[PDB]
């Protein structure tokens, strides 16, 4: 049964339609595809009243009372009539506040707060924030639970109001033990590192709940709820007890196949996010295919020091015979190790730095300028052939980054932002010398208090270049094309094209596509639609997020739909642009690539599944323009 | 799990630590016990370890 009329009767100088907008339940749908709770719910109807109550208190009425709420029902049972019978008073202005009761000689901070300037209209929520301000000064002194009761004094003689606050502060409560219980597989240090209440300190009710929110944010526990229990003895001692119930942390996924033409696919990931119960997250994963082999072991240990300085790293293998489309086909055999340290200086500012080692052994490289510059600088031989483009290198780097995170909802933010900065600069003990910096930023700003209209700015920019006489390595290049970057284009099709020096394929197979190659049949220089990436990048996007296309109440916060405009360019700041008749130059910034479209991102049980349909307005500099983009696990 | 045949759960009560009271100088009185944690004496007897039959 659907709401028919929400009659507010006994208004004085105010409309009905306005009140209707701040209720959970609404009587009509005045817009398109925006149907929330039309199913009548007793709990929501009760909530509509409490908001209505606060609303008139905020306008200046301290004589606002709801006489009775008549829920009649039509005899057909296909309608609900709601009529709220109300009464109101006159405007009243807060003149002063008297705070009376035990302040304990904290009167010069308590009565310095809760002070309202003369001749300002009564606000009901002004009282509640001030009541909580009083409780915060108090809980720092160790009076964790004060009793702050506030009722007004009504004067109709001068149509004014004066407020009384009855601040009764207790005795101090000292925490005796912080006992952790229901820790079936977890050690104690896991729940104890994530506290802001310390055992044997003064209690703060806010400090305990502050610690409660950190236990929810490890995501290794299903349900966390505090219990504040008074020890036999004085009520001046307490044991703060968390009953946690363990999650299914830890998963062994093995997938093994045989395919067509004697193919084999091996995929395995062992992840334990509560490894050995120490609450360190450790796993090992890898896939073996004849197409590509990649294996990584990752050893992350959060909160390793007193400050919370983390320790982490990986041991890894990146090995393949070719790089598919939109990229150049080469044999890589590569492995490395990283170790990261993570340094928290603020709750929202994380700094990181570490030491990265990667060995790359590269062979079978087709002639291409990003490569030509790299092997030129080492003094190895540039060759027409690909066996004479075979080299191995040690590449050793300092890594740094910085993170701002203040994402509000997290899984589907409407407010908040993040700033991701990731960059590296070489340390001696390398054979390469280069620098990079890159960062990506997203800011979500809600343009209404429903959070159904959300303006999302998004941008990513990068620059690196060679250092000293050494060049930019051609496997540390920046790329663009895809969901995160400029959609509507092929993945990694944006940037410097392979201008093809005539390639002499030593192992020329029947019709082995090498584009402009001597073996292929060509003898001239020409560019392709496979982009080797530049050492620079730009992406900027404006997304405006529309409300859900569903009239089902189910999908409202688990699905989002957006209309977007993407723009971007990828360019190499050193380049041979003298290499083709009609070659666009990338040495100085190239023509912008621009795409616009519609997208639907659906939270799915396979991780976030992201579909978009977009058109680049034209093929700019021979970049592959796609009618539809799909990608997997692409986060908000 | 990979437990024993005679009892479920890895047994280490055979490799259990010896318990021996603390001493202190005169002037330091070790704090008196709280609650029930003292190991009672046995006057009886019985088979020990996995030589014990735990059949009902």
């Amino acid at each position: 049964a659907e709401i028919q009329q929400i009659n507010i009767v006994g208004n004085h100088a105010f409309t009905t339609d306005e009140l209707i907008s701040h209720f959970q339940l609404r009587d009509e749908v005045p817009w398109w595809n925006v149907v929330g709770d039309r199913k009548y719910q007793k709990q929501k109807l009760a909530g509509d009243l409490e908001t209505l109550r606060s609303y008139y208190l905020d306008r200046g009425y301290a004589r606002f009372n709801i006489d009775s709420t008549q829920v009649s029902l039509t005899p057909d049972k296909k309608g609900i009539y709601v009529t709220v019978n109300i009464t109101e008073g006159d405007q009243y202005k807060l003149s002063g506040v008297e705070v009376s009761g035990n302040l304990a000689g904290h009167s010069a901070e308590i009565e310095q707060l809760t002070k309202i300037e003369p001749g300002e209209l009564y606000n009901g929520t002004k009282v509640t924030k001030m009541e909580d301000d009083i409780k915060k000064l108090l809980g720092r002194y160790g009076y964790a639970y004060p009793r702050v009761q506030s009722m007004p004094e009504i004067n109709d003689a001068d149509k004014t109001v004066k407020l009384r606050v009855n601040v009764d502060a207790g005795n101090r409560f000292y925490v005796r033990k912080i006992r952790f219980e229901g820790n079936d597989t977890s050690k104690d240090a896991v729940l104890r590192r994530e506290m802001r209440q310390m055992e044997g300190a003064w209690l703060g009710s806010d400090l305990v709940d502050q610690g409660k929110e950190r236990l929810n944010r490890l995501g290794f526990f299903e349900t966390v709820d505090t219990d504040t229990q008074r020890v036999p003895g004085s009520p001046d001692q307490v044991d703060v007890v968390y009953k946690v119930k363990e999650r299914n942390t830890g998963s062994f996924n093995f997938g093994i196949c045989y395919g067509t033409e004697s193919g084999v696919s091996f995929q395995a990931g062992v992840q334990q996010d509560n490894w050995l119960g120490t609450g360190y997250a450790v796993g090992i994963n890898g896939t073996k295919n004849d197409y590509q082999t990649y294996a990584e072991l990752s050893v992350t240990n959060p909160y390793f020091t007193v400050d919370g300085v983390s320790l982490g790293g990986r041991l890894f293998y990146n090995d393949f015979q070719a790089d598919d489309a939109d990229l150049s086909d080469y044999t890589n055999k590569s492995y490395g190790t990283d170790v990261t340290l993570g340094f928290p200086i603020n709750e929202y500012n994380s700094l990181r730095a570490g030491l990265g080692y990667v060995h790359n052994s590269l062979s079978n490289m087709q002639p291409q300028v990003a490569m030509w510059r790299y092997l030129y600088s080492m003094g190895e031989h540039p060759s027409t052939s690909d066996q004479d483009n075979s080299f191995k290198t040690d590449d050793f780097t300092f890594n740094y980054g910085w993170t701002y995170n203040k994402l509000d909802r997290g899984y589907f933010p409407t407010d908040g932002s993040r700033v991701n900065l990731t960059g590296k600069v070489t340390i001696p003990g390398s054979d390469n010398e280069y620098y990079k910096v890159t960062l990506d930023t997203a800011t979500y700003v809600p343009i209404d208090d429903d959070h159904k209209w959300v303006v999302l700015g998004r941008t990513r920019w990068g620059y690196g270049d060679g250092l000293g006489g050494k060049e930019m390595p051609f496997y540390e290049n920046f790329y663009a094309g895809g969901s995160s970057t400029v959609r509507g284009f092929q993945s990694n099709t944006i940037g410097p094209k392979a201008v093809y020096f005539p390639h002499q394929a030593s192992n020329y197979d029947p019709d082995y596509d090498y584009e402009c190659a001597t073996q292929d049949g060509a003898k001239d220089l020409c560019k392709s639609d496979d982009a080797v990436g530049g050492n620079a990048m730009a992406v900027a996007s404006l997304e405006f997020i529309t409300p859900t296309p569903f009239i089902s109440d189910k999908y409202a916060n688990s699905v989002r739909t957006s209309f977007f405009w993407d723009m971007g360019t990828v360019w190499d700041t050193n380049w041979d642009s003298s290499q083709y008749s009609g070659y666009p130059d990338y040495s100085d910034p190239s023509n912008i690539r621009m795409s616009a479209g519609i997208a639907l991102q659906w939270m799915s049980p396979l991780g976030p599944l992201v579909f978009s349909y977009a058109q680049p307005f034209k093929k700019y500099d021979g970049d592959k323009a796609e009618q539809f983009q799909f990608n997997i696990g692409k986060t908000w | 799990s990979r437990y024993k045949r005679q009892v479920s759960g890895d047994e280490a009560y055979l490799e259990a630590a010896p318990l021996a009271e603390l001493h202190a100088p005169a002037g330091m009185i070790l704090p008196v016990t709280s609650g029930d944690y003292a190991i009672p004496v046995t006057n009886g007897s019985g088979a020990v370890g996995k030589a014990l039959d735990i059949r009902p």
């Binding site: 304990a104 000689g105 002194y141 160790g142 005795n171 101090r172 409560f173 000292y174 005796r176 802001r196 310390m198 044997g200 300190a201 003064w202 400090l207 003895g233 004085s234 001046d236 001692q237 007193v306 400050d307 919370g308 928290p344 | 202190a24 002037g27 330091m28 009185i29 070790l30 704090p31």
Partner: protein, 83 residues
């Protein structure tokens, strides 16, 4: 670096109401229960007020109140020195 708040919370004026002649029953009402004592020998209640903000160093005020075995007098030994 988390905020490390430790020890009993001692107001400056309410540690200036501890006077020899006070019983241990009275000291426990005015300051709260001490949460920290000497396990060896006779009871010495130590009311440490220990704060480390994680940006600043130590502020330690040790108020050592010895009630001996009689439990009738309080030997006032106040050290408001950081460690």
């Amino acid at each position: 670096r988390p905020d490390i708040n430790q020890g009993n919370y001692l107001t400056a004026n309410d540690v200036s109401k501890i006077r020899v002649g006070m019983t241990q029953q009275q000291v426990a009402y005015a300051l709260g229960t001490p949460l920290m004592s000497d396990p060896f020998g006779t009871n010495t209640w130590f009311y440490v007020f220990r704060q480390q903000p994680g940006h600043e160093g130590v502020t330690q005020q040790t108020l050592t109140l010895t009630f001996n075995s009689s439990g009738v007098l309080t030997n006032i030994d106040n050290k408001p020195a950081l460690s």
